[PDB]
Amino acid sequence: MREIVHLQAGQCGNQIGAKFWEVISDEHGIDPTGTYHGDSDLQLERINVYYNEATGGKYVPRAVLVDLEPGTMDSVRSGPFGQIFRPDNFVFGQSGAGNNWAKGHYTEGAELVDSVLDVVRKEAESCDCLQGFQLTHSLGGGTGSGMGTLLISKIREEYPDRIMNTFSVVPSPKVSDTVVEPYNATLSVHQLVENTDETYCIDNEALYDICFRTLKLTTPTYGDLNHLVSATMSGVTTCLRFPGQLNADLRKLAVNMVPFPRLHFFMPGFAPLTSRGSQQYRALTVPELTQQMFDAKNMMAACDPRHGRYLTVAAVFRGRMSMKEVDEQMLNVQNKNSSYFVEWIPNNVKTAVCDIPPRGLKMSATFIGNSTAIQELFKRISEQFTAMFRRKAFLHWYTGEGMDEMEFTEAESNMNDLVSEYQQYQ
Amino acid sequence: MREIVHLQAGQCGNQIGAKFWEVISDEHGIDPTGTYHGDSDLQLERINVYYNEATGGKYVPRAVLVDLEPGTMDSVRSGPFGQIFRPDNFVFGQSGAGNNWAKGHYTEGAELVDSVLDVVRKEAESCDCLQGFQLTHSLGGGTGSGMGTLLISKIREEYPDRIMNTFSVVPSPKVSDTVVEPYNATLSVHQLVENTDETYCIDNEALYDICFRTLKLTTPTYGDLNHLVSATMSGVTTCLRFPGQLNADLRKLAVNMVPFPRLHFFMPGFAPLTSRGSQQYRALTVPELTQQMFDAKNMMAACDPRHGRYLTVAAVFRGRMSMKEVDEQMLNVQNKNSSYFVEWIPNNVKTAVCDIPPRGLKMSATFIGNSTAIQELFKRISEQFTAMFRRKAFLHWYTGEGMDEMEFTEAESNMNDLVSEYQQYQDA
Amino acid sequence: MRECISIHVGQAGVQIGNACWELYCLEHGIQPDGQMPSFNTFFSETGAGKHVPRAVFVDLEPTVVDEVRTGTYRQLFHPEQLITGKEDAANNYARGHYTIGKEIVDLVLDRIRKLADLCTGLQGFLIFHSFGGGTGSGFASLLMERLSVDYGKKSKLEFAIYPAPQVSTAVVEPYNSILTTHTTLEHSDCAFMVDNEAIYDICRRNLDIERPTYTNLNRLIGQIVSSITASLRFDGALNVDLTEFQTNLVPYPRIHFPLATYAPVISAEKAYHEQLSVAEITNACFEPANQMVKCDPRHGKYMACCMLYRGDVVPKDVNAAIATIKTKRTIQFVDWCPTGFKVGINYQPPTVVPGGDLAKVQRAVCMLSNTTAIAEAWARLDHKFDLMYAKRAFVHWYVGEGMEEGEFSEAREDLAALEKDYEEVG
Amino acid sequence: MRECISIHVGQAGVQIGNACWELYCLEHGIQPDGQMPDSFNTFFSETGAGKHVPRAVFVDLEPTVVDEVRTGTYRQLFHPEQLITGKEDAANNYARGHYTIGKEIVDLVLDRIRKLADLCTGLQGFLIFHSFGGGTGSGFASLLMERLSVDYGKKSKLEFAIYPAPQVSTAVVEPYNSILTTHTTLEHSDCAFMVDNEAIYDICRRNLDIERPTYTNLNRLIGQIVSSITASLRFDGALNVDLTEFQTNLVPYPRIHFPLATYAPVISAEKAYHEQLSVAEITNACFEPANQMVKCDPRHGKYMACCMLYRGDVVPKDVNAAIATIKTKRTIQFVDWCPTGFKVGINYQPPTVVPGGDLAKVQRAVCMLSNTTAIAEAWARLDHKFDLMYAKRAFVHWYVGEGMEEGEFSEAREDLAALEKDYEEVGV
Amino acid sequence: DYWRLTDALTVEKEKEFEKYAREVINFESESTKKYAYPMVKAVQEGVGGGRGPPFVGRGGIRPSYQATDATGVQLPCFKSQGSKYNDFQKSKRRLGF
Ligand SMILES: Nc1nc2c(ncn2[C@@H]2O[C@H](COP(=O)(O)OP(=O)(O)OP(=O)(O)O)[C@@H](O)[C@H]2O)c(=O)[nH]1
Ligand SMILES: Nc1nc2c(ncn2[C@@H]2O[C@H](COP(=O)(O)OP(=O)(O)OP(=O)(O)O)[C@@H](O)[C@H]2O)c(=O)[nH]1
Ligand SMILES: Nc1nc2c(ncn2[C@@H]2O[C@H](COP(=O)(O)OP(=O)(O)O)[C@@H](O)[C@H]2O)c(=O)[nH]1
Ligand SMILES: Nc1nc2c(ncn2[C@@H]2O[C@H](COP(=O)(O)OP(=O)(O)O)[C@@H](O)[C@H]2O)c(=O)[nH]1
Ligand SMILES: [Mg+2]
Ligand SMILES: [Mg+2]
């Protein structure tokens, strides 16, 4: 009726989705066995969006876990909800790419699409009415950055009308763990602009900034980072799974979020993160959510929106509120920070309400927005890729795969054309 | 509705602000836990002036604690009312100023001004109708005397109409703890004249003199000194928080006070101060309050008003009273000591009544007045600052920060221009 | 499933392999018989339920391997795996490459062929030898040459003793060293050049042992190889395979010579009195006085750094240490690497042998920097070989063995060209 | 948080370290092993095994002095790598310690200070202790300031050291080292704490009734001085004074960074039995020339700045009363360019007592740091002696044979004529 | 009561692992007590990164104080008398009010 298939690419994608599938299983009251132990009828009313029915009152995630190395599948099923996934949905190869975009995209990509596409088509023919698939991957890897681009291109030909969201992981320049990282990001964003309806730019560094300051966690592991990135995309589709006073879904936002097809990159935002000491002195109010929402430190991307102009704003609220406060806070923030908003679009903010609160919490809010600050990231990649590509450095690994040299030039041309028309819209 | 945000600068400011947040917590019946344990409905009707709501029936002070040294906050937090303040309001750093006005105002303050500006704007946008902010600091420091001037300059540009009152601490010449204290003071009062609606000059030595004589305390600590200033300034807004026979506010006093914008320095006075032996033989009467107040010993500044001319007088009263004596005493003191009052303005006395008595006490009164005695402080600083600048002593500390030398002169030139026109108001 | 096969050659190869294998046995809990009272990457199961080391010890002298044959681990090891010769080269690359190799080339090749048949998915070939001994030089050269055409894609790691710049156990070592470099240039993927004198200085200075020995050195060699292989053996938040850290170490086909470092290395008595944390250990990895090759990277410029933490460690502290080391002007980077780090984390702390020297420590670090400061050692060797070849000393030995004397000048010119290429990078 | 690192130089530096750190162990409560059965972080550092490690660099050019510490009671208190030794010493030669022998161990010490600076997050300043007499304490010490000045331009560099006593002397070639060291304590020092042992000799015998004192008895008193300076940093107080606070309020010009210290009261337990201790009594002893720790009389000079550190059971009331009495004394002269030259500092915790010491357990204490121009006569005596040495060309062959130019002697001698002249300009 | 219920739930969930934490300490301290120091440091660290005294009114909550440029060093308590507060009532009878 409106179903989503959870594509999963890379070690980063596998760990992110594994934390995600646990989170909504808590939300829908699904045990590790796969049955329903929940209490409310709404906890099992629209669970068919992500789950598929099995005998014995059992439900299976509609996820296709893909990676080029089998060394991560063990840790996937070693986790809490490791046995909830169907084993036939696990698709993986033997030899990885070694963070080489070339190897994942072309050489060891060619044989593994057929197993992925057959599994993807099987879940595609399972549900009657698909809203769209969902893929999480990293732009600094060899499979998520590499292989991860290829299956997107083929499913656009196979399924053009379906919504295509990507919670990609953009590498950071201040903190980076890969030397060939700019080369992979150079050849992946070109695939993003051509074939993607919307992209969510996440950054691990800004996640690390939040936990140090906003949460003040002493020892933040990647599970904590996976907890945040699962929470925001849980807030994307909570209005889909549960009724609200003002309903919305992916297509309500995506149509309202894309003024022109070339621009589909957004930075998300989650309102109630407070440290344990911050729990003691607060009053839970909608203005407090909005105040923490627009503070530039709350963004988990690597771009401050105060240097850019704001194209379009989304604010999706999870729980029970009164919208007169919600409309007054959107109106208050629109007029006050007038310089940061574009003038050719009055009323840049889109609002949505989801009646069901997040589990364990009373009030929350989720935020999506497109601003001129995202172009700060792309040229920042260009300063490093061109520094690499001028001396033909690290090229024989790519050149040994079998492509020619103009692909870097056209990928460099595409994002330079991207930021140029992005600068014109400022 | 009518809200106040407390700006807190320096070790002096942090301690007195902590003392001030305790007395009104006792007044508004707020436990160190944070909830409300009071008995009277009027104890909780206007608590939103200083407190903000927190879930679970809790109220948080609307304070912004600032200092350049991190160890002062731990003394604030280890204080008994240390778990009443929200931690995000606390803003500080590890690099101090070393009693240098220049380091606070330019070098190290520039990295911290952004965060406190975020905090005060957060508290400003919280309340619907803000009357103004409130900063308390010392002129003998490096943070409150230093970057505290920089905070004031910014928020006047951001919020011009809002009131900006300062219970600033002016250093004493007879007892001092800093040699560059005239240097910081001369570079601070010039920031005061340009950007401040009203200022109250409290001297610690005058506070020291009072407990030497009026209270006869054997070992009064600075907490006692913190106790007087909190009680003095709680009497400023007791009419604001609680209705009275004749209501008044900060803007009611300030508009009725300031004849020309260049003059906003005053000496405050407090009525109910008696030693233990004085409690045995007394009668709580209106004249005794008025009689005690106009004696120059009670005053917490280092200026004798008998050497100057009282420009205007504001006298607010706390507790339930009649206006028969209140008017009969102010008229009596106006006529008797005519030479100490200017002739250009009749009826210099401004009066206000607050019905609610102070906690645990019956009668009280608070007074704010402008006189021609205040230059006894300013010009005596000029007897120091000029006699320290001509040889360029202690200048490399200030010169190493990157500023010029014309700034000392212009601050001095403004201070000589300040007194000179104000001299002219004495003989007018 | 990941597999690394040992191809150790020479007296150094045999002693180092016995070292590394006692560390592997104590790590995996295997008793000296080969019975357990993770492991599969090095061991292999048998019908009798024993665990079989995947090592090929090859030597031209019998006694070095007969010491193992009568050692404790005799029943643990394979009589067929241990390959011995009757007559040695006696520090003669020509003997080792032309006269004595062909007798047992076929036997060694067949042994590694059966080991590769036993393995299913081969990750790597770890090959240990020396640049001084005629055996460890010429035999290593020929087995690289044939192994390259036997397995084109399978990666070949090259751990080898380089002659020390001051102390030497041979006079005819530089001829073998200059003649061997062709194979480590055109038949190697990574090279881990080591001189003894650096480890000598390290163990005297830090470890307080005034009279160490070759087994004391081999303990640290086994420790660094174990820390390299720990990500394959056990779980980590960021597992690092061989392909990943070779890709983020090798920019060009001619530059595959990184320098290594292990920290912390302190005795237990001094380990009583200091905190060991991420910042201190990563600062100790950067000191020129702790470098295991006699050169100062401060005289050169780092252009790649692979990083392998181990034990009790948090990525927050990892990123903080990365920021701290990046904010240092004494440490330089080449202009074409704004981001030159390859970070990996493993959970299990490094184990300890009884009778060893390092104390048991909860967190450790292994550093692998590719820089341009290594070329000065090759320059010293070039001067020494030039003043060797000027008077044509010891030439008669090799000529009687039967090689062509122009190969000496060809190797000298080739290493000069390699130094010139390193100058071009620098 | 605040941290202090000791870079004591010389055998004397090793010995005062032994005295200081035993005292530091007693106040916080460190066992001889190093476990408690954060006031300690400024001196100690936590380990993985939870050991609290001294943050001092013991550096010496001879093995025997530091090896005694290696076999002392606190052998398992100090890190063995930290105690840096030298195989050969200079033997009362500045030149050997500054041009030949120092260079072998320059880096190894300089790697240590960096590693100690690694452990600390916010570093306040550096405590460097040495002696002007010994070659290592003069030669090796002079070079290290020159290098750490460019390594840490902003970090404070305190200097307690030992000046040659104007009559008694343990060396003949001491003035050559003493003169050639004065250049470094001018352009590579922030403060200085010159002391002759003879002044301590007179004070201890006169006051503490120990007719046969040893060097440890002296080092206990110097440890009390350093303890009093850091006491406001280690523990809370009404007026906490950090390192930068009194660096600013003691130094009028960059060329003038030589105050004189004074500690009081210093009296035996039998002596303490019969006499009352009060703030006025204990502060009056601080201005007595016979109790001064430098052989000069400030009554022959003028104070331009006095720094005041109250410790123990002290009250701000008696603080101001004592200041009032001292300001009313013609015997105490002040410069015309500092009317307020008292820098008040108040701490709560009383100074602890070491078993086997000389000071009895007292409740209140005072510390004095007065800069005056009467110190300049002591340098003139050194100029009087060293010049009459240097004309005779004696011991010149020793220094010239090391490899330094003989013209630096005249330049160093010429310098101190300018420093003495500058102190005369302030005296006008 | 909804937030009051969650307050008691936080007390409930913090307790249950403390039993699981404690039984390892008693099991580990079966041979020698010379070696139980890191447990005592671990179970006395407190809820959150705080160094000062616990607040019994709020349930032992230790709020942190981390606002210091990019460093964020936690504030340590130098330790003092920490005397009971004036209440403004003790002095008012000390001053006779
Ligand atoms: N690090 C280390 N080096 C060794 C060891 N054994 C030998 N070497 C080095 O190897 C060099 C000589 O070669 P060997 O390993 O002894 O013997 P080989 O490799 O079989 O070559 P040939 O002597 O010609 O037979 C010496 O210079 C040593 O530096 C060892 O156990 N550890
Ligand atoms: N206050 C004090 N001064 C000392 C002490 N020991 C030595 N001195 C002074 O230091 C001078 C000699 O320097 P030393 O510390 O003994 O030796 P050094 O500094 O290492 O220099 P060299 O003797 O050349 O090695 C003597 O003239 C004393 O005046 C001490 O224990 N306490
Ligand atoms: N935020 C986040 N990032 C992760 C996590 N796990 C891995 N990563 C990132 O993923 C990158 C490595 O991805 P990789 O395994 O090469 O991707 P693949 O080639 O597609 O399999 C690293 O740079 C990590 O920063 C996680 O749990 N959270
Ligand atoms: N009246 C009063 N004055 C105080 C108190 N605490 C400190 N002071 C004064 O404040 C001055 C030092 O302030 P300082 O810490 O340098 O201010 P900052 O630089 O703004 O932090 C001293 O001269 C004291 O007289 C107090 O509790 N009450
Ligand atoms: Mg051999
Ligand atoms: Mg000596």
Side-chain angles (χ1 to χ4, degrees), chain C residues 10-12 15 59 61 90-91 130 133-136 161 169 196 214 218:
Chain C
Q11 174 175 357
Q15 299 189 246
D59 195 6
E61 301 86 303
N91 307 124
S130 295
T135 308
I161 286 291
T169 67
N196 291 62
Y214 267 107
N218 288 13

Side-chain angles (χ1 to χ4, degrees), chain A residues 216 277-278 280-284 288 291 336, chain B residues 53-55 58 60 83 85-87 122 125:
Chain A
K216 313 165 192 52
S278 315
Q280 172 56 58
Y281 315 101
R282 69 172 191 171
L284 192 152
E288 270 203 3
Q291 176 177 246
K336 279 186 169 173
Chain B
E53 190 60 58
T55 184
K58 201 192 180 298
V60 281
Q83 79 285 11
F85 306 109
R86 172 196 312 243
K122 162 185 310 303
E125 301 327 293

Side-chain angles (χ1 to χ4, degrees), chain D residues 10-11 60 62 65 89 92 134-136:
Chain D
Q11 157 285 330
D60 203 357
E62 60 277 6
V65 183
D89 40 303
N92 315 302
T136 310

